[PDB]
C-alpha cells in the first residue's frame, strides 16, 4: 500500500494554475492600504514570479524523486498523525525556492 | 502586458522568440520579433566567388525604426503585476537607448 499525489502535481501543470491567480493579485488596486505596503507585496510576488521555471523544475523533481524513492518500501503505510512532530522553519523553504 | 511568463524548455526546436510571436497581440512588437526570427542570409554568386549578404532592409538601416516603434510601444503599457520601481528602471533603460 502506498500514497500517491494527484496526477496534476507530478507533471507540474498546477503551478501555472497557481501563478495566474498570483498574477491577478498584481492587478487589483489594493484599496484601504498605503502605497508602500502594496509596493512591498508587489516586490515579493514579482520576485517569486520571475522564478517560475525554477519552481516548475523543483516541483517536477520533487514529484519524481518522491515516486521513485517511495516505490522502494515494502510495508503498509497509513496517514495517521503521531505524537512527536517534526520542526521545520519556512526560511529554509524560501532559501530553497530562491 | 502582464501575461503569464513562459517556460521555454532548453532543447525544443522552436525558439523563444517564435513562441512570443505566436503569443502576443500588439502589432509593432510582434512585427519586430517576426523580423528577427526568420532573418536569414542570402547566398549570392558574384564574380565567381560565393558570398553572404545581409537583407537590403539592413544596409539602409530603415529596420532600426521598425525596432524603435516597437520599443516605443513598450513605454506605453502600464506594466501590471510589477512594482513601480521596476517599471521606472526599465523605462530609464529604454529611454537611454532611445
Distance CA A56, CA A14 (A): 9
- Map chain B to HEC letters: CCCCCCCCCCCCCCCHHHHHHHHCCCHHHHHHHHHHHHCCCEEEEECCEEEEECCHHHHCCCHHHHHHHHHHHHCCCCCCCCCHHHHHHHHHHHHHHC
Spatial CA neighbour of B2 closest among A81, A92, A26: A26
Does B82 contact A27 at a Cβ distance shorter than 8 Å?
Answer: no
Could you tell me if B78 and B62 are in contact, meaning their C-beta atoms sit under 8 angstroms apart? no
Residue of B nearest to A49 (CA): B5
Could you tell me if B89 and A33 are in contact, meaning their C-beta atoms sit under 8 angstroms apart? no
Cell 532559501 sits on residue:
A95
Minimal CA separation from B80 to chain A, in Å = 6
Q: How was this structure determined?
A: cryo-EM
A1 membership: H or E segment, kind and range = none
Does A16 contact B4 at a Cβ distance shorter than 8 Å?
Answer: yes
Spatial CA neighbour of A43 closest among B89, B6, B76: B89
Write out the E strands in chain A: none
Which letter does DSSP use for residue A73 in this model? Answer: -
Q: Which residues of B touch A52 (CB under 8 A)?
A: 5, 7
Could you tell me if A20 and A49 are in contact, meaning their C-beta atoms sit under 8 angstroms apart? no
Helix (H, G, I), strand (E, B) or coil at A79: coil
Amino acid at each position: 500500500l502506498n500514497q500517491v499525489l494527484n496526477d496534476n502535481i507530478r507533471n507540474g501543470h498546477v503551478i501555472n494554475q497557481l501563478m495566474e491567480a498570483l498574477m491577478q493579485l498584481s492587478r487589483q488596486q489594493f484599496p484601504t492600504m498605503p502605497v508602500d505596503y502594496k509596493r512591498s507585496i508587489q516586490r515579493g510576488i514579482l520576485l517569486l514570479s520571475n522564478r517560475l521555471g525554477q519552481l516548475v523544475d523543483l516541483t517536477r523533481l520533487l514529484a519524481y524523486s518522491y515516486e521513485t524513492l517511495m516505490a522502494c518500501v515494502t510495508m503498509n503505510m497509513q496517514h495517521v498523525q503521531t505524537l512527536t512532530t517534526e520542526k521545520l522553519q519556512l526560511t529554509s523553504v524560501t532559501s530553497l525556492c530562491m | 502586458f502582464g501575461m503569464q511568463r513562459m517556460h521555454y524548455r532548453n532543447g525544443d526546436p522552436q525558439t523563444p522568440f517564435q513562441i512570443a510571436e505566436q503569443q502576443i497581440q500588439n502589432f509593432q512588437v510582434a512585427n519586430w520579433l517576426h523580423f528577427v526570427n526568420n532573418n536569414y542570409f542570402r547566398q549570392v554568386v558574384i564574380d565567381g566567388v560565393l558570398n553572404q549578404v545581409l537583407n537590403d532592409n539592413i544596409r539602409n538601416g530603415h529596420v532600426i525604426n521598425q525596432l524603435m516603434e516597437a520599443l516605443m510601444q513598450l513605454s506605453r503599457q502600464q506594466f501590471p503585476t510589477m512594482p513601480v520601481d521596476y517599471k521606472r528602471s526599465i523605462q530609464r533603460g529604454i529611454l537611454l537607448l532611445s
